[PDB]
Amino acid sequence: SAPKHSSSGGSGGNGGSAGSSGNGEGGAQIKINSSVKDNTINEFLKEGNMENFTGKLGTSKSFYIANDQKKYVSLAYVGCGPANEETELEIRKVAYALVTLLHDSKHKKVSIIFEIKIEEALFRFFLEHLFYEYVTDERFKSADKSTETDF
Amino acid sequence: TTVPQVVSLDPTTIPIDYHTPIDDLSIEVKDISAEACPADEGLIVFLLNSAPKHSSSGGSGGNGGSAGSSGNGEGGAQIKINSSVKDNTINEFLKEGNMENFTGKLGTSKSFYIANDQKKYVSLAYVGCGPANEETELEIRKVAYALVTLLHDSKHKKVSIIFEIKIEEALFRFFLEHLFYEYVTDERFKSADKSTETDFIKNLSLHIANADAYKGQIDKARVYFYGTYYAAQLIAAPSNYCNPVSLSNAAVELAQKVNLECKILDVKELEELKMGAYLSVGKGSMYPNKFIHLTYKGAQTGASQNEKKKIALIGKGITFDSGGYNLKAAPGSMIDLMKFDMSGCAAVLGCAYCIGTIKPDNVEVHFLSAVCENMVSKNSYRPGDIITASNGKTIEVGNTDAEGRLTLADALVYAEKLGVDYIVDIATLTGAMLYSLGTSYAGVFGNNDQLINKILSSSKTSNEPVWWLPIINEYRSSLNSKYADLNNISSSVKASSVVASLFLKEFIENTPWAHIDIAGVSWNFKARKPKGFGVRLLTEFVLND
Amino acid sequence: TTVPQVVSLDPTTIPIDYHTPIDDLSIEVKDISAEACPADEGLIVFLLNSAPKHSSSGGSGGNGGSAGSSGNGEGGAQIKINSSVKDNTINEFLKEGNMENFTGKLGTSKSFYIANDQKKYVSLAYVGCGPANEETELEIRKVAYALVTLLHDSKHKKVSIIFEIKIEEALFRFFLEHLFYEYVTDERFKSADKSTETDFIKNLSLHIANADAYKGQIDKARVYFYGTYYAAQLIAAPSNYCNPVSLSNAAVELAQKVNLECKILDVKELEELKMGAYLSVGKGSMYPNKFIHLTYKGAQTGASQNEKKKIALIGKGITFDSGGYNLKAAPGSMIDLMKFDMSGCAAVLGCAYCIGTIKPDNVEVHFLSAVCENMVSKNSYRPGDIITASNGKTIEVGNTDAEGRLTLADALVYAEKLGVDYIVDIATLTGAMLYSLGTSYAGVFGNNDQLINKILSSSKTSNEPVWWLPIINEYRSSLNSKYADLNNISSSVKASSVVASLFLKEFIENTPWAHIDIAGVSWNFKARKPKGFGVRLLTEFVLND
Amino acid sequence: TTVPQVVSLDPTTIPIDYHTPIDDLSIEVKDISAEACPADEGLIVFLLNSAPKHSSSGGSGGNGGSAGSSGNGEGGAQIKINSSVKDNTINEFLKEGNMENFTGKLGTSKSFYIANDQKKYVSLAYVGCGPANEETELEIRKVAYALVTLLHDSKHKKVSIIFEIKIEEALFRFFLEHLFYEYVTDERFKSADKSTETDFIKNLSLHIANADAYKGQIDKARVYFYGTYYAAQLIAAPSNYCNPVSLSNAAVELAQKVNLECKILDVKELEELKMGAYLSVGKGSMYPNKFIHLTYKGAQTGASQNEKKKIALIGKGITFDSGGYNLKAAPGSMIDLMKFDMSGCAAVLGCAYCIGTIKPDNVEVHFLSAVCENMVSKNSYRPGDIITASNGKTIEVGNTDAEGRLTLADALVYAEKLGVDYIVDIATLTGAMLYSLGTSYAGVFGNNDQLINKILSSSKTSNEPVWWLPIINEYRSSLNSKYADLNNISSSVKASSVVASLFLKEFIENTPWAHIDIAGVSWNFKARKPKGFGVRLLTEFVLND
Amino acid sequence: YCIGTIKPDNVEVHFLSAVCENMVSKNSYRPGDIITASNGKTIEVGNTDA
Ligand SMILES: [Mn+2]
Ligand SMILES: [Mn+2]
Ligand SMILES: [Mn+2]
Ligand SMILES: [Mn+2]
Ligand SMILES: [Mn+2]
Ligand SMILES: [Mn+2]
Ligand SMILES: [Mn+2]
């Protein structure tokens, strides 16, 4: 999340409550990206296509868009919360929002971009909880048994 | 009339939004044989049926219909968008499908912003509806819920929905109404996120096959939606906001703007009608008892071409139900949700709005409700008290928490003296409806088979699930009292809904009567909000007489 | 097979009376056109209706017909005039002013020993039936109950009953059956009061108007009485007498005396059928699991006379239901009455007797029942266990007290593999039926409307009240399990009967199926005895197919 | 202001003893290097540690100072009082050990009247303290309890206590205070047993080693004792004596006698502050809502000597807690002890006495408390009501028994507008603290680590056990409401204290804040009296700023 | 009634009864209240149902 201490669409905290209606001047969530393509790597780049994201926590926005050659790529945005208020609860919620995007068999190759500043232990924990949410337990099902090769 | 206050910070009015964002929504229905939507569009949704094969090797198929081969899972086919959207270099992508992992079970949407012939992103979407012709009201509710979760992105001022499914016209109307009901949120009691901005939708273009048979449902869906939303707004209001006087004022103000004859009765004129059972329930409250009596008189289009059906609709109308001295102390008593015990009255008032707007002909509806509170105080009625109703029968109050059937008894005796043909009451009477029909069907009892058949035929059209339940005259002696004429509860019978209708059947003399028990279906427990159940059912009942 | 014993004083058999006082009771039906009764016959009963209507103050019958000029009771004279001069010319000298102050509301008998023509006393009586045409099954039950209380005087070896009421033929048959059921007493478990004596009746004359339309119901009433009496004898037997082994032995004996194909399945052949859900319930018992499979093959009276309907009737069959590790410890759990949890199996066995005696044509019935106990021990199944049914689906046991639907699931998968047209399960499944329909109506669920209509039309004739209840597919996702295919109970739905029917609907593939929930209507709580519910219903269903 | 009365025998004041036996008790501390006590004395006590023996196989010495140590009760030594005594009739009566039975575990007193130089019996005694250095607050409480049971003999006007144990100075002060607290008895509500007599002590000599480091604690112990005794007198007063009006009168009187600025706020000025959450709780009472606001302004000893710390201390103050419409009906609800629900307010008032007497410098404390009742009547607030706090947030009342956090919310919004550096609440908030820390430790929550460290460091010195508990922001979404800003209780989280702290954290904007949950540690259940918990803790917190 | 009708001799009966209700209101006595009787003894109300 870009802004801080405002109340028109979110909660503040009064670390300075000088207006900021709609966050007022807290800004957008423009990303410092280097995605090499042009079509789907310019809007999700310097340009602005952040229509209603407002990344509270979870609240993803997946979309299959064609990246400069062909082949809709399904770029996505996932919300993590304020800039440095990242704890294990935030990481668990983000991993849960991210595996709900991964449950589409169309993806055999995934790229995750960390525009957030987190520790190394928290990075390890993000990886582990991503794996833990991704892998499902199917040992006691009659149908739904033979795990497909779409991971 | 003035609402009594304990402190000066008490509320004096129910806040009501008489103007919804749906009033500004411009809707239009075009035949699916010419779309031309995506070129300069904002959002496009596709409702697609799943294609489950003769059996599922992992696809959750069910039975062996005409075969049981079940190859490749359920590989009988794959979903393909059988309509092209005339945006010529868009409909190309429509013929290619690009259906990567959709498998439209139910809900399970896939929002995606493919670019148009401009660096604009349209956010085309696909929403799953289920098998090809197994579309009921549950499917429609789930699809509307999945579709409003895509609408909560303020980027869209013009939505466009494409119906690749084959549904009825009543189901189409119900889809529209439930879409509106999910879309509009209640923000009357918030402090932040209060002032609504310009983020809502301004256009809604629906594309369906044979659209001229559907474009008569638009105005009916707007009226039905607002009736349901008004009712849900009354139910969701807390009891420090919705008291008997506040609700009386709301009914007056509603009848003022739908041009109904309002007539509120006070305790002075309730004592002259001998309404002792209704008065004993409201004794122990700080708010006076208010009896609402609205009236819609249709325009006589035919002197003898028809007969003027006179109907009386009655609601429970208990703004808070603590149980009285039989206090709701047990586990699972749901005393925190007992603000919804006026759901029948709210349904009657919503249907009053609906019928004052539609204005049917050759009909006369009486909208009755005995509003009161069931509170504990020193003026409360006590378990064991003997009260006299308006027809003369004496009732022993074996349970102060069975208070709705007393106010309904007095209201029924009042309704029979008006001279109506049908009496239909609707009430959140018994908590036993949750163990019998659950949270999806409302039970209907009665003393006339033609009236119950009319109510069921109107439940078909309005898509409000009603199931006919029996009035078992074998438990009638369990209401026998040693000293009074009746007891209000059963001694050693646990079918509380059947006993409640047996009790209420003793106050109807010679009139066709039915009772709709909505105790289980009023509150949506998972969403924590009211459903507004009953408005569309009662409206479609009145309109088809 | 041999019943296991903990101590040598354990019982090894269910005591069954195969010969009732009714077997030697000579019945006869003669037209009321000639009585010739009073020649010294121990008892003479008169069934008389209430004379007036539409009044109150001692004859309260609601309002709606005239409601005017009651004066001193009813609007008219309000006294009954007995026809049927009783062909003596000196007993008809008593049809003048007896005037019958009993005013026969319902029951209200009045016995009296007038003298006939010499110094013997005939004990003529009058019994009240109610209004002149509002005669239902409840009235008939109450009249039979009042009439046996006059029959418990050993002075009567001959009885004459006079029907001055106008009733149907099916209701006349039901009156006969319920009279027999009230008359005979269960004396199998007494120490004194054991040796039955001559005191029973030896003749029974029934005088009815146009009796030739009724005298075909006599044999059917005898067969139906004994089927119901056999079922009630099985249900009334305690669990140290009625265990799975004793019950399978009783079924073998029954099939021997009515010439059915008996086939009991032991645990060895149930393990090869993969009946894991039925075996897990019976794990923690000291008695082996027994699967009864009787078969009636009707005589093919014609090759292409009809289509041979093949029916499978299934009963629950849990000889004792403790709850397992979800022990029945809560108040109102009725654990001392849980011997009645084999009422479905007992109804199926009584119907087996009825159909083996009647021997219909062009029908093939399969009488299935998976018999076990639900005990607490160290070998019992636990809450959370995952078991596999015989069709493959795994089931998570979220509640060990929901054990009837698991054994019924396995029995249903077995019945579907026989190749039948209809499956009808009957079971005391959910204790929630007591809050939905109470103790008088059984609820029927199903997946086919023609089969449910057949069951309702056969409940009309057998006079066993059945009410059609809905299978609500909205609650199907509350049976979803994280690890198994289904859970056996619902997370956050209290409609227990609808959820049980949803669970059982998952084990039927492509067959018309219905399920009768008799949990509430099989035990007569006021009389502390079983009703035998379901025998006549199932028999009339089979006989009309 | 005047206390309202239902009957004329209603009490109109809280009886308070402003003069205790301790005020007349002359205390003196002299070094143990010269006792000279028993020369013309009345009572002498000796506090002696358990003599260390071994890994005791004769009493279970506990852990492994040695493996087994081969001691078994006689491991290393026995006890010997090696300090002094003056009169050598008894001085040389204990020099030869003379114990022979003692083994001073904990408590375990042995009083005995030996003559000395007269026939005067002096009643020298011995009290056990435990191991030689494991002296904590629990040991000191037990020793003081055993020592007052020897003081309840009126023969003693002089007492000498000999400290042969090695303890700190804060623990010596705590010993003095708890001795005084056990000694004085509350006799305000007796009929006999009222008129206190001369029997109390008039002198108290304490002989300790290096006594000049201890004789500064005497005045602090007297002030702390009276603060705790005042608080316990308020808590022990029943609710017909301690109502909001009586309590605000008591606060006015206290502020008058310790020279604080009293300021009581009535309902008129609370309606203008928009304190709707605090007024809704007190709606249904017969007593008006009172808001106590005392103020201590320390003498600015220097202009820029320090920064003048401004502290706000807040107490819960619910003179009787019935639960409201969520009545305390369940078992173990302790509704007869709910008079102690003003223990936070009483601790704040006792601390007000302590700080008005000590008069620290460079500090400004605000003693706030929102006093009301939580009663059931016809004017009370109901479950589901939506109320507005004085900062604008709306609150849905999902439970009327969670009333302390609403009044605390309003008091916190009031305290933040004063402009303080620290806010500290103290409240008997959640009955769940009994399952988490029991009856000995109070839990402290907070939003600042330096403030919590200050509270813990002041619990070290005051010897009131406090344990730091976490505010878990993961449960914040369980307080989300559909219609209001927050709910006052949690949907599906049972950690009630963490949820209460999460709720209160929503009404603090930018101020260091901490909250002490004393629900479990304020009532001594075994002695059936209040502890007075929190007075010494809050005083030592304020004095060390 | 029976004794006013029979009218026995050499007897004097006092028929006493303290009539009241035990209701829940905002004027009710609470669990824990301490009340004084007519002989002076104070009573702690540990249970309002007794
Ligand atoms: Mn109620
Ligand atoms: Mn109610
Ligand atoms: Mn069970
Ligand atoms: Mn069972
Ligand atoms: Mn409380
Ligand atoms: Mn409290
Ligand atoms: Mn009592």
Numbering used by the authors:
A (entry chain E): 124 to 274
B (entry chain A), C (entry chain D), D (entry chain C): 75 to 619
E (entry chain B): 427 to 476
Can you provide the manuscript's text about this entry?
Data were collected from samples prepared in the presence of 1 mM Mn2+ to encourage formation of active hexamers and resulted in a map with global resolution of 2.8 Å that showed Pv-M17 in the conserved hexameric conformation. Map quality and resolution was the highest at the core of the hexamer and reduced toward the periphery of the hexamer. Each of the active sites had density for two metal ions, which were modeled as Mn2+ ions, as well as a single carbonate ion. The carbonate ion electron density was planar in comparison to the Pv-M17Δ125-151 sulfate ion tetrahedral electron density observed at the same position. The position of residues involved in metal-ion coordination was conserved between the full length cryo-EM structure and the Pv-M17Δ125-151 crystal structure despite the difference in metal ion identity and inclusion of the carbonate ion. The Mn2+ ions in the cryo-EM structure were slightly displaced when compared with the Zn2+ ions in the crystal structure, although this may be because of the larger atomic radius of Mn2+ in comparison to Zn2+. The carbonate ion bound in the cryo-EM structure active site was positioned 4.3 and 3.7 Å away from Mn1 and Mn2, respectively, distances that are likely beyond the physically feasible Mn-O bond length. While electron density for the Pv loop was poorer than the remainder of the hexamer, it could be modeled extending from the exterior of the hexamer into surrounding solvent. In its modeled position, the Pv loop is coiled and partially obstructs the substrate access channel. The Pv loop interacts closely with the substrate regulation loop from the neighboring chain and together the two loops appear to have capacity to influence substrate entry and product egress from the active site.
